[PDB]
């Protein structure tokens, strides 16, 4: 019984449903994998260092949550897969003593979306989530607009062909995505009257927070606009992460089955 250590770095961190669904899968596939994984939440001080901490804890793999996803992309030894276009890393694997960075948010988000027929999207936020979601939605051929408070990640989104606005675009969007940290603060990501304008005219309000009904989602619910929280995304990207942690031994669709059940 070789033991292998995993975790999720975040700040804040201990509401994470991730250790439960990953340890479920580490328990289930012990025999295929030929080790027992264990997965813990990890409070990472803002002023620490993801790579150094990873090496010091002896981890075989990690997930990375806000606000460290852009930092993870910068400090990895090597970036593979769609991560390269996301400028954000949410999955870390030790491969050949090199810290390798993946992004499973993009495809995780893709798989959570039950409908295809959205023309355009407004993304709120500019962290690693917004970055992966913009990259995924452009890929699908939506028009993507991005609105942050201030000047953050301008160049990244510009270079994808996103329209980066200063003020709220006066325009209808099918898909309104909250990828800010606002729900965490129990806050709306935008002035309320503005958001209501988007909601009266949009097709789906989408919040990355999972579990609790956020101010953003509850206002969409109040206006009767269809809404979706981050639960389905969370299960998909975890499954996809797990496929990485398994060094491609266990395909994400098998992980997803155990994970969705347990959740």
Token pair 């990873």 in the structure block, residue: 54
Task: Measure the CA–CA gap between 9 and 45, rounded to whole angstroms.
Answer: 9
> Which residues lie near ligand SKM (CB under 6 A)?
8, 16, 18, 63, 65, 90, 105, 234, 237, 241
Strand 163-165, strand 143-147: pairing: parallel
Given 4, 31, 51, 69, the catalytic residue: 69
Q: How far is the CB of 64 from ligand SKM (least distance, A)?
A: 7
Q: How far is the CB of 132 from ligand SKM (least distance, A)?
A: 8
Q: Which residues of 5-39 are buried (b: 16+ CB within 10 A; e: fewer)?
A: ebbbbbeebeebbbbebbbbbbebbeeebeeebeb
Task: Measure the CA–CA gap between 128 and 105, rounded to whole angstroms.
Answer: 9
Strand 3-10, strand 163-165: pairing: unpaired
Element (H, E) at 36: strand 36-43
Nearer to ligand SKM, 5 or 143 (CB): 5
For residue 113, what are its two tokens? 């979306």
C-alpha to C-alpha distances, 165 to 82, 157, 162, nearest whole angstrom: 25, 11, 9
Q: How far is the CB of 18 from ligand SKM (least distance, A)?
A: 3
Q: How far is the CB of 234 from ligand SKM (least distance, A)?
A: 6
Which one, of 242, 170, 173, lies nearest residue 18 by Cα? 242
Nearer to ligand SKM, 127 or 202 (CB): 127
Nearer to ligand SKM, 204 or 235 (CB): 235
Nearer to ligand SKM, 139 or 203 (CB): 139
192 is catalytic: no
Nearer to ligand SKM, 180 or 241 (CB): 241
Task: Measure the CA–CA gap between 232 and 85, rounded to whole angstroms.
Answer: 23
Q: How far is the CB of 204 from ligand SKM (least distance, A)?
A: 19
Catalytic positions, please? 69
């Amino acid at each position: 019984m070789k033991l292998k250590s995993f975790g999720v770095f975040g700040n804040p961190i201990k509401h994470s449903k991730s250790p439960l669904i990953h340890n479920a899968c580490f328990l289930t596939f012990q025999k295929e994998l030929r080790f027992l994984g264990h997965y813990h939440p990890i409070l990472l001080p803002l002023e620490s260092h993801i790579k150094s901490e990873f090496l010091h804890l002896g981890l075989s793999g990690a997930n990375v949550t806000l606000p460290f996803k852009e930092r993870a992309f910068q400090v990895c030894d090597k970036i593979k897969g769609i991560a390269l276009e996301c400028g954000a890393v949410n999955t870390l694997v030790l491969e050949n003593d090199e810290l390798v960075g993946y992004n499973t948010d993009a495809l995780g988000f893709y798989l959570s979306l039950k409908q295809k027929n959205y023309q355009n999207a407004l993304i709120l936020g500019a962290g690693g989530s917004a970055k992966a979601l913009a990259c995924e939605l452009k890929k699908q051929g939506l028009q993507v607009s991005v609105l942050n408070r201030s000047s953050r990640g301008l160049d990244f989104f510009q270079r994808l062909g996103c329209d980066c606005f200063m003020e709220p675009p006066k325009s209808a969007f099918d898909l309104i995505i909250n990828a800010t940290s606002a729900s965490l603060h129990n806050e709306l990501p935008l002035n309320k009257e503005v958001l209501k304008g988007y909601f009266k005219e949009g097709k789906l309000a989408y919040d990355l927070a999972s579990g609790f009904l956020t101010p953003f989602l509850s206002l969409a619910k109040e206006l009767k606009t269809p809404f979706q929280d981050g639960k389905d995304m969370l299960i998909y990207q975890a499954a996809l992460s797990f496929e990485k942690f398994s060094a491609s031994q266990i395909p994400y669709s098998k992980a997803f089955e155990v994970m969705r059940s347990v959740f």
